[PDB]
Amino acid sequence: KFVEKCSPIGVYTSGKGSSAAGLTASVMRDPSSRNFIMEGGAMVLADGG
């Protein structure tokens, strides 16, 4: 808990993802607009962290 607070950028999660947030990133096509939406997990949401 403290180390997450004290890093410049840091994210403290569980192995089992998080509440409405994964752990690894995922990317998925959107059939309507065809854009590959990129759900950001802890690993990428704290890149450089």
Add this chain to the structure above:
DNA sequence: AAAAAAAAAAAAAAAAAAAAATTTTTTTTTTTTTTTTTTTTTTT
């Protein structure tokens, strides 16, 4: 000297020209939602 022809000016009428002018509805598109199939994942 009187008559008359011509001139300019003024007016009426018919043909052409001038001018004025937003609102309502429909359809594509995007975006989600729902059903049902397919796929994948957990159990004995």
